Amino acid sequence: LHMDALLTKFNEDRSLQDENLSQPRTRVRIVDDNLYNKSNPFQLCYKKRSQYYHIYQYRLKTFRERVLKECDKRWDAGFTLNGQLVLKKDKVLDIQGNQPCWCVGSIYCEMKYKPNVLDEVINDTYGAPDLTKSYTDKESDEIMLEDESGRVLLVGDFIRSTPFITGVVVGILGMEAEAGTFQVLDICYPTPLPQNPFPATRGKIALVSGLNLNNTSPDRLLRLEILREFLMGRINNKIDDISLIGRLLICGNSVDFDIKSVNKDELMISLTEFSKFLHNILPSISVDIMPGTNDPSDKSLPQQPFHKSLFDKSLESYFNGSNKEILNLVTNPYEFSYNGVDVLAVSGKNINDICKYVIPSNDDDIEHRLDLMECTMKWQNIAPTAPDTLWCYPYTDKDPFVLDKWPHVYIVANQPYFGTRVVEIGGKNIKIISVPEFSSTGMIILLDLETLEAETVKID
């Protein structure tokens, strides 16, 4: 059929009912209890501002203690192997014999850098040497375990089908076969963290990221207007289903520019273009603003909120400090307690920086990102790569990036594709969700709060 036939079949059959416009349907109330309770974890003092080693030491000690507790809970005395008896070793140099043993120690790999980022950084240093020589001069692909007393080549098959990044603490237990190379039979992970109980009318949450509103791409504004109209219940017209979206969560990358050559005018134009959209969406559905890697904020991971400025003057009624449930500007990482459901969201700089390296082991697809997210959740360390992601003076004696309580849903954004994965670790349940960019394939993620079911909404 033609477009005229569909139009005559749809518009002529319009019901034109339920649009009273005087008694509208109220949106489902969804409150983030972490708004005013206490202990903003990623809120640092910019005025306060190497400490990386101090952080490394504390992280290594916490991880070692956790791994030791996990070994005591798993490899306790009397855990005999098939033929031989199992033993424990304190130093890495102590395991030498035809007997299995369990030990704790960090992992050390190659973790070479990508060539693209190499030239990308080289082109802006004013006379740097050929970094390609730094990798090609050496003769590579081997995993070793360092325990402050030596290194042993961890050869085996169970290590091949597992991802690893240098700096992780592992309590693997094996036995040497013919040289100073320890085999592997099982792999241990630190103790499971305590998780809040899942609560037993219910609403949904809209997550969108990768907007990248620039002065050159006009299709982004059209998609933004279409999304604003669809969330307002004007497109779908199913108020019974649209009113279940309590709030919208912008994860990051709302403005995209190259900080090398920008002026105040372009940023102001982009912020005022965003301000409109904001003024049209605010009085209908709440919004959660989060910064990103290309946003006008700090380039490190724990980014403070943008500012009270950088928005239209008509938004002063929302920045009065009293209407916070309608619009909430939060840091880059945050653990939102949406009606008792603890969900952690990150801008995605950690995974993007981990993928920025080329590891010559472990054998850019959706499964790879999901496995990396699962490993990040298991390792209880949000930032595995310290110097590329983290900044100086993150915290004193208590790192925030080390996980202390497992959440219900791990939300990551700024990814090329979309996907979900439900992982079970120590009887717990974690649902990892990969949010894609809104510029290219601007899909909208709808996350439910009753059954943790994520749905997608495409916009062309």
Partner: protein, 197 residues
């Protein structure tokens, strides 16, 4: 002259850019839809990204704005190179110019005028490359150029040099009219015209 200078400048810039783009006088790949060209533009217009054309149009608009005190008409001609004959003529009227606020309203009026211009240009047939070029013609009230060099014009700064190079860059000279909508705002009383064949 306090704020109408920048508004008229960006209006003439968008005018020239749209004329050059929609008439295929330059390759469209050299044009990009933008909104900032050192001045906030009221619409996503296709602006060229070539250095020579950039300061060319800049100096042209600067001379036009300086001579506005006596100019009442600004025309952009489109002529062929195989024969020096006028093919298209786009006229911009400046009747008294309302010479000696609400910038958003001025931007809306400029957007409406540019939309009318684009709608008029979209109905014209396709124009080919290979020396289908353009010119520039102006109409003043009472002025005479090309005679400021009778005293060797001993220069002392950049303003005098610019004035001399502007007064010396002009040379004297000697169908279906289609009207368009102009700017009916208070300070900027501008009218639009067009010619064909």
């Amino acid at each position: 002259n306090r704020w109408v200078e920048k508004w008229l400048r960006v209006y003439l810039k968008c005018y020239i850019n749209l004329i050059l783009f929609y008439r295929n006088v330059y390759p469209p790949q050299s044009f990009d839809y933008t909104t900032y060209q050192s001045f906030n533009l009221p619409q996503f217009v296709p602006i060229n990204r070539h250095p020579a054309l950039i300061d060319y149009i800049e100096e042209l608009i600067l001379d036009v704005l300086s001579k506005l005190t006596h100019v009442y008409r600004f025309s952009i001609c489109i002529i062929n190179k195989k024969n020096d004959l006028c093919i298209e003529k786009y006229v911009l009227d400046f009747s008294e110019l309302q010479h000696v606020i609400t910038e958003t309203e001025v931007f809306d009026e400029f957007r409406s005028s540019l939309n009318s211009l684009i709608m008029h240009l979209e109905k014209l047939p396709k124009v080919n490359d290979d020396t289908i070029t353009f010119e520039a013609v102006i109409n003043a009230i009472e002025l005479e150029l090309g005679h400021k060099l009778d005293r060797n014009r001993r220069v002392d700064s950049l303003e005098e040099k610019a004035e001399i190079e502007r007064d010396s860059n002009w040379v004297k000279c000697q169908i279906k009219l289609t009207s368009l909508v102009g700017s009916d705002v208070g300070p900027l009383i501008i009218h639009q015209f067009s010619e064909k064949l």
